[PDB]
GROMACS .gro file of C-alpha atoms in nm:
model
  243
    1UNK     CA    1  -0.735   0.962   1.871
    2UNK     CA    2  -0.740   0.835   2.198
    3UNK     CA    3  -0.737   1.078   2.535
    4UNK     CA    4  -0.445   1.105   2.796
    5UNK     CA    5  -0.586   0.887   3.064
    6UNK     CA    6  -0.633   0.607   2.837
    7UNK     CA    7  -0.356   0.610   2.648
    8UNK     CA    8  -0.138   0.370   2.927
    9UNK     CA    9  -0.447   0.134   2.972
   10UNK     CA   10  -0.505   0.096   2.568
   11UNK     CA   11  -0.159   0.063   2.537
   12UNK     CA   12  -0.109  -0.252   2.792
   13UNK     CA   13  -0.453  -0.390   2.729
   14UNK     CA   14  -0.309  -0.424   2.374
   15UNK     CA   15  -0.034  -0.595   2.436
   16UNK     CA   16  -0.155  -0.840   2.663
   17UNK     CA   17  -0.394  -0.946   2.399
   18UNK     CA   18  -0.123  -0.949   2.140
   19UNK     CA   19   0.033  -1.183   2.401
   20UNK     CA   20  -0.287  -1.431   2.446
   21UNK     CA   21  -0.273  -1.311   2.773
   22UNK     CA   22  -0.688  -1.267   2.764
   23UNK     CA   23  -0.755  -1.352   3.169
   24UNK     CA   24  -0.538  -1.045   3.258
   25UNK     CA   25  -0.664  -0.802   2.964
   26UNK     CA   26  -1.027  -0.881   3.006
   27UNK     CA   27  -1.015  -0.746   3.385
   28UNK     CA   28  -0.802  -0.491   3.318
   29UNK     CA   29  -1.073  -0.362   3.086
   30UNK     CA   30  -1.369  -0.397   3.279
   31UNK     CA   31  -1.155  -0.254   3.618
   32UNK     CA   32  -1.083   0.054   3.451
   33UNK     CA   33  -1.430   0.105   3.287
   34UNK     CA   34  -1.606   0.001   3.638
   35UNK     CA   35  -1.365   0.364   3.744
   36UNK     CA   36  -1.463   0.543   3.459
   37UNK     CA   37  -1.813   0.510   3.504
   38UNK     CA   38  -1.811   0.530   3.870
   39UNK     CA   39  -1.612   0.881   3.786
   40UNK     CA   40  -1.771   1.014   3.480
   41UNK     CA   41  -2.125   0.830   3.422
   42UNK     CA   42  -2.225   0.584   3.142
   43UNK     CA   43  -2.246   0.799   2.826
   44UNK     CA   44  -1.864   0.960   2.824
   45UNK     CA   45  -1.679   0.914   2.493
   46UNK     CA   46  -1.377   0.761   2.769
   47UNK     CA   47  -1.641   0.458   2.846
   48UNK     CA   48  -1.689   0.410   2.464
   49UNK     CA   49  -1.308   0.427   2.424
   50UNK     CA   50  -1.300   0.107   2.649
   51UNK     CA   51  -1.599  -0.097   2.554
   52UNK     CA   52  -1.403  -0.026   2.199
   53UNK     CA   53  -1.058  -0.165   2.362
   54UNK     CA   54  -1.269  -0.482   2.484
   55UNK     CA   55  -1.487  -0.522   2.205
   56UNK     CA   56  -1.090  -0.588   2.062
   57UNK     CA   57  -0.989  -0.837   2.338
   58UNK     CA   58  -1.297  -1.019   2.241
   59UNK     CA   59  -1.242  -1.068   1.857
   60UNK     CA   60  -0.903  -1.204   1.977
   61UNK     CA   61  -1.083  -1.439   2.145
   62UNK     CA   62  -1.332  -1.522   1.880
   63UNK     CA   63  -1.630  -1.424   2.149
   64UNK     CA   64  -1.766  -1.207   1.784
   65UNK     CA   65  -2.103  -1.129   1.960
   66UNK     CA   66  -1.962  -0.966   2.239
   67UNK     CA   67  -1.728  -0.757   2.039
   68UNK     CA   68  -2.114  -0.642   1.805
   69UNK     CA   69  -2.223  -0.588   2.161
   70UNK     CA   70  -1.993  -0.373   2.279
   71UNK     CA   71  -1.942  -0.133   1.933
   72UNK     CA   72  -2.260  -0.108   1.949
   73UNK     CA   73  -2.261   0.033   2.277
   74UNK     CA   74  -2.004   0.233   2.214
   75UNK     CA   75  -2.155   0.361   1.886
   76UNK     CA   76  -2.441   0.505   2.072
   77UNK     CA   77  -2.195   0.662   2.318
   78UNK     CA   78  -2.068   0.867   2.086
   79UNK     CA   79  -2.358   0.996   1.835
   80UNK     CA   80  -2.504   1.107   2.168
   81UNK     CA   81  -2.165   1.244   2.329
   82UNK     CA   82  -1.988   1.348   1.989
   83UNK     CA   83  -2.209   1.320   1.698
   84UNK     CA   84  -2.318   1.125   1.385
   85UNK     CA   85  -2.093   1.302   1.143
   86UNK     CA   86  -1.760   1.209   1.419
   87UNK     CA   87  -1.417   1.036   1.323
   88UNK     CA   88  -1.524   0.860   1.618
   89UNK     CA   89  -1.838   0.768   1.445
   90UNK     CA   90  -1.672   0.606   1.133
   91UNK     CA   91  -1.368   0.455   1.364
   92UNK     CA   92  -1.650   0.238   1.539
   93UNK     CA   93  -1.883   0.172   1.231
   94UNK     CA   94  -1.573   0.038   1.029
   95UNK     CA   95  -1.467  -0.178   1.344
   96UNK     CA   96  -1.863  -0.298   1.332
   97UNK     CA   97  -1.864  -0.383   0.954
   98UNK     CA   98  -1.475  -0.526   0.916
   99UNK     CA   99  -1.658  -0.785   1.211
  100UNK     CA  100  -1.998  -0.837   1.050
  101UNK     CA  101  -1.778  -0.899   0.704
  102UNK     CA  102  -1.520  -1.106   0.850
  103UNK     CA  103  -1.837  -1.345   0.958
  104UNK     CA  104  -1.986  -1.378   0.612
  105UNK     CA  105  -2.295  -1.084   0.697
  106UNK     CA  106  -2.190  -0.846   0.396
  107UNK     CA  107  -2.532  -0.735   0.348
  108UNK     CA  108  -2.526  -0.604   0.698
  109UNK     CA  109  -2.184  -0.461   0.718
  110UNK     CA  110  -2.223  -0.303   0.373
  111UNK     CA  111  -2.474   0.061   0.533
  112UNK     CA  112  -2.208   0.100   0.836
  113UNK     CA  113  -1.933   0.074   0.541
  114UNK     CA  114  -2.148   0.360   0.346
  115UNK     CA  115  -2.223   0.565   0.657
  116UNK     CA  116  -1.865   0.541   0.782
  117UNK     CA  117  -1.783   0.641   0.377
  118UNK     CA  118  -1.985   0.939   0.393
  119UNK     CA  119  -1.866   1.084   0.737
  120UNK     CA  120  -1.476   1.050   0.579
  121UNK     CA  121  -1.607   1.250   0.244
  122UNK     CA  122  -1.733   1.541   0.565
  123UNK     CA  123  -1.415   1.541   0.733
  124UNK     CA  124  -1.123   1.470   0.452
  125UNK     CA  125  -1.273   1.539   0.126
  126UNK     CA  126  -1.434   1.306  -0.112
  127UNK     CA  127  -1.068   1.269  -0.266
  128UNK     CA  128  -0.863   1.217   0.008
  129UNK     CA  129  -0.658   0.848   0.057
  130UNK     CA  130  -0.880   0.722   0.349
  131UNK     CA  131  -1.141   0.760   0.178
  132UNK     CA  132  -0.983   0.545  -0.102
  133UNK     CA  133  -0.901   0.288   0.149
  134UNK     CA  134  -1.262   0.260   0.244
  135UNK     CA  135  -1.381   0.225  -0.103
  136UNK     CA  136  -1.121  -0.096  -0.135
  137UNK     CA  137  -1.359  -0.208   0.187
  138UNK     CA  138  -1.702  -0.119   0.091
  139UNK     CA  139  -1.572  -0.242  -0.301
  140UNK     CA  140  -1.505  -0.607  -0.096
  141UNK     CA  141  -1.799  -0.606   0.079
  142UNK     CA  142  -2.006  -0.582  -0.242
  143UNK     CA  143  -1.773  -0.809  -0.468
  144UNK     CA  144  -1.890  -1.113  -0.160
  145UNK     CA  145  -2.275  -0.977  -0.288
  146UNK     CA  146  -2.219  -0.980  -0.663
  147UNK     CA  147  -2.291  -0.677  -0.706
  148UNK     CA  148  -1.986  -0.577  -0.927
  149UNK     CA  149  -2.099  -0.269  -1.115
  150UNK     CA  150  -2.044  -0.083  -0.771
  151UNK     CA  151  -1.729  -0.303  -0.719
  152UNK     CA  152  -1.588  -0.199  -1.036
  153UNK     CA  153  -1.674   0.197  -0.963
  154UNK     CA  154  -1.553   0.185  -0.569
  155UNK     CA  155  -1.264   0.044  -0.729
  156UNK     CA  156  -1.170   0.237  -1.031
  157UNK     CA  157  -1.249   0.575  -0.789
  158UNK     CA  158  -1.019   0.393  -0.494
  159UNK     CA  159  -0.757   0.413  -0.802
  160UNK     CA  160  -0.806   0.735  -0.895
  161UNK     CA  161  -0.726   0.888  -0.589
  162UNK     CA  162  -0.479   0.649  -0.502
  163UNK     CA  163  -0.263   0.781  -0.770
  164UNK     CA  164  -0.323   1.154  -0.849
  165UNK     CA  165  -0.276   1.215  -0.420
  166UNK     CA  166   0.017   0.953  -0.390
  167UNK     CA  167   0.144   0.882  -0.730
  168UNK     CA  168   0.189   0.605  -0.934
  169UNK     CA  169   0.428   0.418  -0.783
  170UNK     CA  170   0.276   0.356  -0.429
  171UNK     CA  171   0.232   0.056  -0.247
  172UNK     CA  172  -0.187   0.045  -0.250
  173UNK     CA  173  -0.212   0.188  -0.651
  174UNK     CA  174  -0.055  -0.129  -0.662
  175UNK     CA  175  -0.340  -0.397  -0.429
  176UNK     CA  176  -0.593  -0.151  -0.555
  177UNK     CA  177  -0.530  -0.295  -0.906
  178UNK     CA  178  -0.509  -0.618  -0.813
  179UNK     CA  179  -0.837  -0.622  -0.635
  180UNK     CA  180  -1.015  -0.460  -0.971
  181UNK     CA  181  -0.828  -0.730  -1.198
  182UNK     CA  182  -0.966  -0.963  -0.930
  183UNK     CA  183  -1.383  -0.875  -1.001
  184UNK     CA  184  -1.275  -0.838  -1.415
  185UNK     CA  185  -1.192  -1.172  -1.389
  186UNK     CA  186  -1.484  -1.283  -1.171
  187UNK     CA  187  -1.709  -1.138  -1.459
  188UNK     CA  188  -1.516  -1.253  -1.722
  189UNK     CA  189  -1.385  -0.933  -1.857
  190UNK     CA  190  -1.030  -1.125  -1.903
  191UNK     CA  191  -0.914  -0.826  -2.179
  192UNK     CA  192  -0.922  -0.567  -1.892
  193UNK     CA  193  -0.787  -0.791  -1.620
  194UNK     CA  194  -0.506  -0.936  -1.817
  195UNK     CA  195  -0.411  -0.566  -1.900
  196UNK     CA  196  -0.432  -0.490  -1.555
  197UNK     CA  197  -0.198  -0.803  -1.467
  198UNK     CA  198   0.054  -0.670  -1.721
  199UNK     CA  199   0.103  -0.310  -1.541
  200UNK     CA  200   0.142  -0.497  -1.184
  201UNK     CA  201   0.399  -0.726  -1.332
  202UNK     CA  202   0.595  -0.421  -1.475
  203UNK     CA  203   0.599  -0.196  -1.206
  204UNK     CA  204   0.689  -0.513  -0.948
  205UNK     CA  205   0.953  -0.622  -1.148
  206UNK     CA  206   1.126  -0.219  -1.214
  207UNK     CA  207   1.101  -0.205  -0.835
  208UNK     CA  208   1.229  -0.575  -0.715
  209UNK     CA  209   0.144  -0.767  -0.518
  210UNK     CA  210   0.407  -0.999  -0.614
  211UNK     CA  211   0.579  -1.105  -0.916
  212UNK     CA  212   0.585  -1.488  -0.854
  213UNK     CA  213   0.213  -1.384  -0.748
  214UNK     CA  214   0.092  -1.185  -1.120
  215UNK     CA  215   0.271  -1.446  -1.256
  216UNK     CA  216   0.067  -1.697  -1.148
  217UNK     CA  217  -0.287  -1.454  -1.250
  218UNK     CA  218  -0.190  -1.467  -1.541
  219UNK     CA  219  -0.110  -1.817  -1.636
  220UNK     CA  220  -0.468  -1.881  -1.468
  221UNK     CA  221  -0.643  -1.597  -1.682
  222UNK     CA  222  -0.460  -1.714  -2.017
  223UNK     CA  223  -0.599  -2.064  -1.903
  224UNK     CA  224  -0.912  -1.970  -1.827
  225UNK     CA  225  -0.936  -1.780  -2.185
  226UNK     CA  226  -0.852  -2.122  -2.357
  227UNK     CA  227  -0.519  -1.956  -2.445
  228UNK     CA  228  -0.332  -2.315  -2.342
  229UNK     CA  229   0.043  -2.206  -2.450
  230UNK     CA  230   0.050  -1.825  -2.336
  231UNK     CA  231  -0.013  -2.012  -2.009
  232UNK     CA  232   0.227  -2.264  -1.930
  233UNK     CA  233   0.455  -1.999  -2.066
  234UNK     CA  234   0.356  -1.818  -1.781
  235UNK     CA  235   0.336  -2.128  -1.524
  236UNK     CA  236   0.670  -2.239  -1.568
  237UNK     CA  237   0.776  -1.891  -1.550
  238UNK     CA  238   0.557  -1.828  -1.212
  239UNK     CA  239   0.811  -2.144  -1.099
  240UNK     CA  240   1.127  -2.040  -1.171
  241UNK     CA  241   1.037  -1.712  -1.020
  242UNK     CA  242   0.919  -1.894  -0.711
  243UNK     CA  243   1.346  -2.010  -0.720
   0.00000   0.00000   0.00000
């Protein structure tokens, strides 16, 4: 959701910073939020809109405490302008916590991952697929804290709704899986992981999350186990599918 007379400057800001053309986008930005303040004052969800499109330039160019600057600013913007239960709100808090996470500060990016969690459950539904996609987040952002009881849950309810709203074939049922195997393994639950493992490699195989790539989990978890031929079994079949 972005308004009509920001819809050509988001559009070419983007691209310029797609092109590593930074000294052109980073004026651009600050031009046309110099006018929009001039026209429509500081606290207009159109200003937060563009410190949002420059808080973007700058993660491009790794400048990572200007981008927190500038969501932040923009966060304010719009509880004041839109309020705190907004799919504004959650667009911005997300954007905050995918930085703070990307940096290694999971313990700080993991409340805007809940609060941007809770404003999706007011808007779409507690069962609805972004909601899903932010529980694969919030699931990674606790799996970097150990804190894998929640990681298994955010993940196992990720799945659920994954595959009774799109079915069991789709795309993310499929990464979704993967990323649960992923913290079964990392506890040592190697029974529910390697059964896990099994149903990727089946449905990847039917349809061509790779196969080469559950291939390979699998000859590591057999290892792993201590079961040494059920894994080079699966090794030297992770190679010839690599062929």
């Amino acid at each position: 959701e972005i308004p009509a007379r920001l819809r050509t400057l988001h559009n070419l800001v983007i691209q310029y910073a797609s092109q590593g053309r930074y000294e052109v986008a980073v004026p651009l930005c600050k031009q046309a939020l110099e006018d929009l303040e001039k026209t429509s004052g500081h606290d207009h969800p159109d200003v937060a809109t563009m410190l949002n499109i420059l808080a973007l330039v700058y993660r491009d160019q790794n400048k990572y405490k200007d981008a927190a600057n500038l969501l932040n600013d923009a966060l304010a913007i719009r509880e004041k302008t839109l309020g705190k239960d907004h799919p504004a709100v959650a667009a911005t808090l997300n954007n905050l916590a995918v930085l703070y996470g990307k940096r290694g500060k999971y313990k700080e990016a993991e409340p805007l991952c809940k609060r941007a969690l809770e404003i999706r459950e007011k808007v779409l539904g507690k069962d609805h697929p972004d909601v899903a996609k932010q529980l694969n987040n919030l699931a990674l952002l606790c799996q970097n804290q150990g804190k894998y009881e929640e990681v298994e849950y955010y993940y196992q309810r990720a799945l659920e709704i994954y595959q009774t709203k799109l079915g069991p074939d789709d795309p993310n049922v499929a990464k979704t899986k993967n990323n649960l195997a992923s913290c079964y393994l990392k506890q040592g639950k190697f029974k529910q992981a390697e059964t896990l493992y099994k149903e990727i490699l089946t449905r990847a195989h039917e349809r061509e999350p790779t196969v080469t790539t559950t291939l390979k989990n699998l000859g590591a978890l057999y290892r792993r186990q201590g079961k040494f031929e059920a894994a080079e079994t699966l090794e030297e079949a992770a190679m010839r599918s690599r062929k």
